[PDB]
Design a protein around this ligand. Structure first.
Ligand SMILES: C[C@@H](NC(=O)c1cc(C(=O)N[C@@H](Cc2ccccc2)[C@H](O)CNC2CC2)cc(N(C)S(C)(=O)=O)c1)c1ccccc1
Length: 379
């Protein structure tokens, strides 16, 4: 009910589905930039040279506290890549914790399909662990520096509100950002925020696949990835079930592949014809699990309107992956997600801002009895 972390509420913004960003100030004197919050990587990097899609960038020569590490860095993502130069400088988050730390910072001088036109962000904050940092795990990630240099608790939480804003509470949890209880799943290993999915249902119907398939390779929580990405075999079965569940209206095959869009007269989108999707996650007690359920409002994403027209176009945001399951924004937008690094667990609760209608709502329910969950993980 109360809120000691009130100043961190609503500290995230977004340019209509182009990424959620927080303001970060680097150097001396102060240089504030919009930084994308990414739990799917571990490097803190900022544009440091002009670029057509950047309104501003980091000017190292103007920062008296900047220290060049004399080493380059290259970071390739599922989408895009950039090259830069490593260094360290003072960093603070205006609408985040009341501290200032010296952190590693990669100055991006060149990039390919990384920055997004009109997104309004100029850098990225990799919140994952050192194991996946580039060039190697010796480059301490921003959050590791924050925790080592200050007394800020080793935990952060994200409330991503879709359609653009949200909140990144650093060092704690804010109760006004969620309703109901928080359910926790173990962080299986500290590299990506890896978790274990034990069951999948479409409108209450079990997909009936060996749970090993759901985590083949791995399953992670990634705020830097837009879609809910599933391994090939899982994607195919999911689409077949979703199509069967939404048979009231037929769509072209390309729609389910994200190649085609479907638009409806403003305010006439028949959400009711689309099914809800439930992912069951391993719990904190033996043989116990819980489930998170999303609505079509989460997996059917709006596409930048033509020009304030009377047509709402949507893209099916569930796609395939060859590197495991990626629970991106499609999943996160329906919940308040707690990255409890201190206790190696991730909590989920219904978000106070998730988009829904008068008939159905996103949900987090439990507990359920699921046996042999340990075997679901890939070795
Ligand atoms: C920013 C934007 N992301 C995107 O548009 C977007 C970004 C990525 C992507 O590679 N994200 C990067 C960081 C990263 C961040 C910004 C730019 C480049 C790379 C992230 O570290 C990857 N984590 C890897 C472990 C999976 C991947 C995809 N997909 C493949 S998809 C189409 O299936 O969703 C889309 C977005 C939009 C709305 C909500 C959240 C994110």
């Amino acid at each position: 009910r109360r809120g000691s972390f009130v100043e961190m509420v609503d500290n995230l913004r977004g340019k209509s589905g182009q990424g959620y960003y927080v303001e970060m100030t680097v150097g001396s004197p102060p240089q504030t930039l919009n930084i994308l919050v990414d739990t799917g990587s571990s490097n803190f990097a900022v544009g440091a040279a002009p670029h057509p899609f950047l309104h501003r960038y980091y000017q190292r020569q103007l920062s008296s506290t900047y220290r060049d590490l004399r080493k380059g860095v290259y970071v390739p993502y599922t989408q895009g890549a950039w090259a830069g130069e490593l260094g360290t400088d003072l960093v603070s988050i205006p609408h985040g914790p009341n501290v200032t730390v010296r952190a590693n910072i990669a100055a991006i001088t060149e990039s390919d399909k990384f920055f997004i036109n009109g997104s309004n962000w100029e850098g990225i904050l990799g919140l994952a662990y050192a194991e996946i940092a580039r060039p190697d795990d010796s480059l301490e990630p921003f959050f590791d520096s924050l925790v080592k240099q200050t007394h800020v608790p080793n935990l952060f939480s994200l409330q991503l509100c879709g359609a653009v804003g949200g909140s990144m509470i650093i060092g704690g949890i804010d109760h006004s950002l969620y309703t109901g209880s928080l359910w926790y799943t173990p962080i299986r290993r500290e590299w990506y925020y890896e978790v274990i999915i034990v069951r999948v249902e479409i409108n209450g119907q079990d997909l009936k696949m060996d749970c090993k398939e759901y985590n083949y390779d791995k399953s992670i929580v990634d705020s830097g990835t837009t879609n809910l990405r599933l391994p090939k075999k899982v994607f195919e079965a999911a689409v077949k079930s979703i199509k069967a569940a939404s048979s009231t209206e037929k769509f072209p095959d390309g729609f389910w592949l994200g190649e085609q869009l479907v638009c409806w007269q403003a305010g006439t989108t028949p959400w009711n014809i689309f099914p809800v999707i439930s992912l069951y996650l391993m719990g904190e007690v033996t043989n116990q699990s819980f489930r998170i359920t999303i609505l079509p409002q989460q997996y059917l994403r709006p596409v930048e309107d033509v020009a304030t027209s009377q047509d709402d176009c949507y893209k099916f945001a569930i796609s395939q992956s060859s590197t495991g399951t990626v629970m991106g924004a499609v999943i996160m937008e329906g919940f308040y997600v707690v990255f409890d690094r201190a206790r190696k667990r991730i909590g989920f609760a219904v978000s106070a801002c998730h988009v829904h209608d008068e008939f159905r709502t996103a949900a987090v329910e439990g507990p359920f009895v699921t046996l042999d969950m340990e075997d679901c993980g890939y070795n």
